[PDB]
Amino acid sequence: SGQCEVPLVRTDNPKSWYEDVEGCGIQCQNPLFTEAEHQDMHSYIAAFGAVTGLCTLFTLATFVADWRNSNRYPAVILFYVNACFFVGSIGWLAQFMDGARREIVCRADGTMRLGEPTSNETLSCVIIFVIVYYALMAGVVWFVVLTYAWHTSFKALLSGKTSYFHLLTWSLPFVLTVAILAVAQVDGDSVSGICFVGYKNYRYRAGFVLAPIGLVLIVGGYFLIRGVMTLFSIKSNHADLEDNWETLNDNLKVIEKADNAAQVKDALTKMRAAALDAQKATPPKLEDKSPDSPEMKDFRHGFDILVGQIDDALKLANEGKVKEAQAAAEQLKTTRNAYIQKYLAASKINETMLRLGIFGFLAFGFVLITFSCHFYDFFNQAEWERSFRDYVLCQANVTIGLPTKQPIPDCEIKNRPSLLVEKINLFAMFGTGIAMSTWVWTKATLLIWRRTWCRLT
Ligand SMILES: CC(C)(O)c1ccc(N2CCN(c3nnc(Cc4ccccc4)c4ccccc34)CC2)nc1
Ligand SMILES: [Zn+2]
Numbered sequence: 001s002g003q004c005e006v007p008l009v010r011t012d013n014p015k016s017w018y019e020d021v022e023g024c025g026i027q028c029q030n031p032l033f034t035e036a037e038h039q040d041m042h043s044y045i046a047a048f049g050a051v052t053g054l055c056t057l058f059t060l061a062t063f064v065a066d067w068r069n070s071n072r073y074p075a076v077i078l079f080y081v082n083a084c085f086f087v088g089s090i091g092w093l094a095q096f097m098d099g100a101r102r103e104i105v106c107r108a109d110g111t112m113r114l115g116e117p118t119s120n121e122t123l124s125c126v127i128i129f130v131i132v133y134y135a136l137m138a139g140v141v142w143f144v145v146l147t148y149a150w151h152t153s154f155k156a157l158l159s160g161k162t163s164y165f166h167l168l169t170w171s172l173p174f175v176l177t178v179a180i181l182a183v184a185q186v187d188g189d190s191v192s193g194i195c196f197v198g199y200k201n202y203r204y205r206a207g208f209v210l211a212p213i214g215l216v217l218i219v220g221g222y223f224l225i226r227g228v229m230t231l232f233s234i235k236s237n238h239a240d241l242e243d244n245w246e247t248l249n250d251n252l253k254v255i256e257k258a259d260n261a262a263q264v265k266d267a268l269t270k271m272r273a274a275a276l277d278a279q280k281a282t283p284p285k286l287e288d289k290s291p292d293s294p295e296m297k298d299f300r301h302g303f304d305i306l307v308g309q310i311d312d313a314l315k316l317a318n319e320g321k322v323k324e325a326q327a328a329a330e331q332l333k334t335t336r337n338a339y340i341q342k343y344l345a346a347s348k349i350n351e352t353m354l355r356l357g358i359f360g361f362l363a364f365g366f367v368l369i370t371f372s373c374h375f376y377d378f379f380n381q382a383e384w385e386r387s388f389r390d391y392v393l394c395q396a397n398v399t400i401g402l403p404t405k406q407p408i409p410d411c412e413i414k415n416r417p418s419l420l421v422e423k424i425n426l427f428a429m430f431g432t433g434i435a436m437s438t439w440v441w442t443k444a445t446l447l448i449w450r451r452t453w454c455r456l457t
Contacts, residue, residue, distance in 0.1 A: 005395045007031030011109040015118065019389075021396055025111030028102065030190045032388060032416045041191045044423060046096055048430040053089035055437035056082040062440040066448045073158045073165075074149035075352055077142060078359070078439040080169070084139035085433030091131030095193030104128050104195060105188040113188025114200060117181055129186045129195040130177055133208075137173035139432070140216050143363050145169060147223035150356045154230045155288060157346045172212075180208055192422070202381035210378055213371050217364070224360050230287065231349065231357060237281045238347035244278035245344060247271070248336060255329040264317045264325050271332075272310045278340070279303035284347030302339025309335060355439075362435055366428040373425035377417065387414045 004010050008024035011017065016025035029038065063070040063079040070076060095101040104124045107113055116125045145165045149158055180186060180197045185208075187199035198205030251267040251274075258264050279300055286295040313328035394411035 005398055008392060008396070009110050011111055013107070013109045013111075016107055016109055016111040018392065021392070024396075025107075025109060026114075028106035028110055028112055028188075028190060030112070032384065032413065033191045033419065037419050038191050041419065041422070042095075042193060045092055045193060045426065048426060049089050049092040052085055052430045052433040052437075053093065055434050056086040056089070059437040059440045060086060062445050062448060065452050073162055074146065074153055074356060075439075077146045077149060077165070078436055081139055081142045081146065081363075081436045082433065082439075084135045084142060085430075085436065088132060088135035088139065088433070089430075091128050091135065092194060094128060094131075100124070101190065101193050105190045105193065112190075113186075113195060115184050116186035116188065116195060117184055125186060125188055125195040126181065129180075129197070132194050133180070133197060134173045134177050136429070137176055137212060138169055140213060140367060141169040141172050143360075143367060144216050144220045144223075146356070146363065147220040147227070147360050150353070150360055151223040151227040151230070153353060153356075154227065154234065157284065176208055176212065180204070191419075198378075200381075200385075202378045205374065205378050205381075209374050210371065213367065213374065217368060217371060220360075220364060220367070224357075224364060227357060227360070231353075233282070234284050234287050234347050234349060237287065238284060238344070238349075240281045241278055241340070241344050241347070244274045244281075245336075245340060247274040248332075252329055252333065255326055258322075258326065261317045261320060261322045261325065264322060264329075265314065268310055268314045268317060268325075268329075272307060272314070275303050275306050275310060279307075283343045285343065287347075299343060302335070305339065306332065306335050359436065359439060363432055366432040366435065369428035370425055370432075373421050373428070376421050380415070380417075383415050384417055387416065390414070 002010060004021070004024035007027045008018055008021060009027045010023060011025040012023070013025070018024055018026055029035070033041075059082040060079065063076070063082075070079070095104060103122070105113055107118070107121060113121070113125045116129070117123075145168070149165075152158060152161075183204070185197050185201060185204040186195050187197075188195050189199055197208045248271055251271045254267040255264050258267070282291075283295070283299040286293055286299065289295055309328065309332055313325045313332075316328070317325035391411055391413045395409065398409075399406050
């Protein structure tokens with residue numbers, strides 16, 4: 001035994017000395033976790049890191065294999081999301097290279113990497129931090145771009161905005177990465193096997209992880225609610241029109257096979273009810289436009305004509321003319337196709353837009369979990385530090401000289417981080433990438449790869 005007791009190791013570097021304990025620094029194998037926990041977390045990260053790596057690479061290769069058709073917004077946003085999670089996996093898997101984990105996570109003296117960039121130490125820690133943090137943050141800024149684009153693409157039935165998507169997603173995590181290095185708040189950890197911001201000083205996790213993720217949840221959340229509201233607004237008004245069109249089509253059949261004015265008058269009144277009900281509906285072309293807009297007046301005008309022609313046939317039928325009323329119903333079919341059919345087509349929401357919403361909501365859930373776990377660690381780090389400090393000073397309170405009848409040391413870390421919370425965080429973090437990679441899990445991509453192999457061989 002020597003000058004230092006577990007979890008401190010002997011060091012000649014004063015920048016590594018732990019508070020009042022001169023000549024001792026914190027052992028590189030994170031003292032807050034057991035060896036069994038370390039080996040369990042490394043297997044977890046290796047599994048999740050490799051699967052994210054393979055699934056995102058497949059989605060990247062599938063996009064570039066059909067790059068002529070695939071490079072189209074808002075679908076190509078999923079390509080860039082998958083690129084962030086691919087680059088991210090490399091940073092997480094680097095620790096599995098013979099001896100790289102200890103090279104990334106330890107100082108030259110065998111203590112924990114803290115407050116990096118540190119003078120005279122290698123750059124292995126900052127590079128791994130840059131890859132993991134930049135990829136993690138670019139991936140979530142792309143999530144806000146996914147929610148915004150899905151919200152704004154309903155206005156069709158993104159030109160120019162595409163460059164502002166790239167400017168925002170690649171320069172924002174850049175500014176955040178340079179800011180962390182300027183304040184030097186990168187810390188190493190042997191259980192995650194990476195270097196990251198605010199592991200030790202929890203205030204920096206709050207400002208560089210919780211605040212940016214927090215803001216993407218309120219902004220991304222707002223555009224998801226506005227988009228899902230617009231979607232059910234278009235879907236309901238479309239189905240209303242289809243139901244009114246079907247009512248007009250069925251009562252037109254009745255007037256065609258009628259042999260009395262009472263059968264004609266009854267079907268015309270049911271047609272008049274449908275026309276005035278369909279007039280109340282908001283056309284999909286003006287789903288976000290004024291109720292007195294030029295497009296809105298046009299839609300209503302068509303039904304005013306259609307009502308007039310129903311009433312003109314009703315005047316003849318109400319008095320006694322049967323033949324003169326039935327012939328007018330044939331003319332209603334032309335007015336129907338010229339003034340209504342145009343609006344029953346402008347509300348057909350395509351499959352891309354349908355699953356782009358599913359992916360946005362699914363991505364939101366995983367980012368919300370990530371936020372909650374990062375919040376848990378932020379909130380409880382102050383108590384995990386006083387527990388550790390008390391444990392260190394308990395262990396360092398060693399008997400000096402010949403043995404007196406002193407009781408056996410009784411030291412333990414009271415409260416320590418939750419490995420389960422870290423496993424939930426990493427599950428939702430790597431789970432976003434694996435879930436977003438299933439964007440190309442369609443029958444159409446099976447054909448893209450069939451076509452590619454045939455051209456190669
Ligand atoms: C210096 C000392 C002993 O006081 C100290 C201080 C803090 C500390 N950490 C280690 C890393 N801890 C973790 N934080 N976040 C996460 C989740 C995460 C990391 C990076 C990117 C995204 C999520 C962890 C995942 C696995 C294992 C540990 C994780 C927090 C507590 N460990 C030791
Ligand atoms: Zn339809």
